[PDB]
């Protein structure tokens, strides 16, 4: 029953910890609870004991990793605040990708990511938003947020590698561009090179700027 | 080589579209290359001949089903027809459900999807977007149409089922308000509420508006 954990209240953060490590150098994939529990040198029966289930640790691990909520600072320039949880949820959801999937899969509710939340509706209630343009800012910034790193994350596999060189990465390139070229105007293969080497999040402070103003 | 299954240009087409009703009805796990096989009434080699492996099946997968690429009315609206192709893309996300964890890992770069994309930015061309602008124009569409599909299906588990009464609802989404007010200020389980509540879509055109006028 997705979220259910939270309903329901060697030590648990240590192993959510050593689960995320897990995750970060893996995936949802290599998450293994034998591997798991050899990391925190116990038997499997010691985590079970803790951590209920494989899924149950996915949603501790969803939300201890979600950033803190954003500050609201004192000058009331609630767009500098909203701009700034935004960021800080971005480069969250980029260090640890493999949270992405598992969102998809259940809202957070666990407690970190509902005082994330509340802090985004205090800083809109605090620009007097009314409630109904508060959902739709609200629901703007995480929907933006959330694509915005999806997209990076799969672009990574295009943009450049730590050891390539540039001629080596164009020579990778290449023919993804001759055949985006072919088929439809050069605006697109244009767009395909950007994608490729827009800075790591360039692209993503350039849309959230595009959407506060917005508001 | 995520992508590459492009560049290298029963029949597939049948293939493809057993394995998007596999993938529909089950998930990405689902989609076994026996199963799909018998439901084709093959051996699985005869898949194996056309489609080399379950990986780029997928990337055949997530083209197959992207949406026509948006019309362009000749009223000049673009603000319309990015509205347009933006729902059209955000449908198919929501029918598809599966396609979000496969974007993920590999960018679109096949024929429907760059021709979805090419069609994007000619709108925006003819509004007299500039390189630049059309860059963030056509992300904030992108990330917020994904960002919105990611979040409307986590929110699927927390909404009425079919055959269940709004009491029974209420009753089992009741748990979950009560921990919200209880640690954060009512205006979060007030969000929580309709969130769960929001019609199917509702909240993705709302925050489309907030963000086409954006632009």
Same mark, same amino acid.
Request: overall charge negative; glycine content about 6%.
């Given at each position: 029953?997705?979220?259910?954990?939270?309903? #329901?209240?060697?030590?648990?953060?240590?192993? *959510?910890?050593?689960?995320?490590?897990?995750?970060? @150098? %893996?995936? *949802? #994939?290599?998450? !293994?609870?034998?591997?798991?529990?050899? =990391?925190?040198?116990?038997?499997?029966? =010691?985590?079970?004991?803790?951590?209920?289930? /494989?899924?149950?640790?996915?949603?501790?691990?969803?939300?201890?990793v979600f950033p803190?909520?954003?500050?609201? +600072?004192?000058?009331?320039?609630?767009?500098?605040?909203? /701009?700034? &949880?935004?960021?800080d949820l971005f480069e969250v959801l980029l260090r640890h990708s493999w949270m992405i @999937?598992?969102m &998809?899969?259940?809202?957070?509710?666990?407690?970190?990511?509902?005082?994330?939340?509340?802090?985004?509706?205090?800083?809109?209630?605090?620009?007097?938003?009314?409630? !109904?343009?508060?959902?739709?800012?609200?629901?703007?910034? $995480? $929907? $933006?947020t959330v694509?915005a790193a999806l =997209?990076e994350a +799969?672009?990574?596999?295009?943009? !450049?590698?730590?050891?390539?060189?540039? @001629?080596?990465? *164009?020579?990778?390139? &290449?023919? $993804?561009?001759?055949?985006?070229?072919?088929?439809?105007?050069?605006?697109?293969?244009?767009? *395909? /090179?950007? +994608?490729?080497?827009? +800075?790591?999040?360039? #692209?993503?402070?350039? &849309?959230?700027?595009?959407?506060? =103003? %917005?508001?």
């Amino acid at each position: 029953q997705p979220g259910s954990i939270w309903l #329901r209240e060697l030590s648990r953060e240590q192993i *959510v910890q050593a689960a995320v490590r897990l995750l970060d @150098e %893996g995936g *949802v #994939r290599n998450l !293994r609870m034998r591997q798991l529990a050899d =990391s925190l040198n116990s038997a499997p029966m =010691s985590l079970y004991w803790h951590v209920s289930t /494989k899924d149950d640790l996915l949603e501790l691990a969803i939300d201890a990793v979600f950033p803190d909520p954003p500050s609201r +600072s004192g000058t009331g320039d609630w767009r500098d605040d909203i /701009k700034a &949880g935004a960021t800080d949820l971005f480069e969250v959801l980029l260090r640890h990708s493999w949270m992405i @999937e598992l969102m &998809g899969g259940h809202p957070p509710v666990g407690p970190r990511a509902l005082a994330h939340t509340s802090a985004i509706i205090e800083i809109l209630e605090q620009a007097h938003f009314s409630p !109904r343009q508060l959902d739709s800012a609200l629901s703007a910034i $995480y $929907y $933006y947020t959330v694509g915005a790193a999806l =997209s990076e994350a +799969s672009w990574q596999a295009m943009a !450049r590698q730590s050891a390539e060189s540039e @001629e080596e990465w *164009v020579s990778r390139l &290449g023919p $993804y561009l001759g055949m985006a070229t072919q088929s439809h105007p050069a605006s697109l293969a244009d767009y *395909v /090179k950007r +994608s490729a080497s827009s +800075s790591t999040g360039q #692209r993503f402070h350039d &849309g959230l700027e595009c959407m506060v =103003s %917005g508001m």
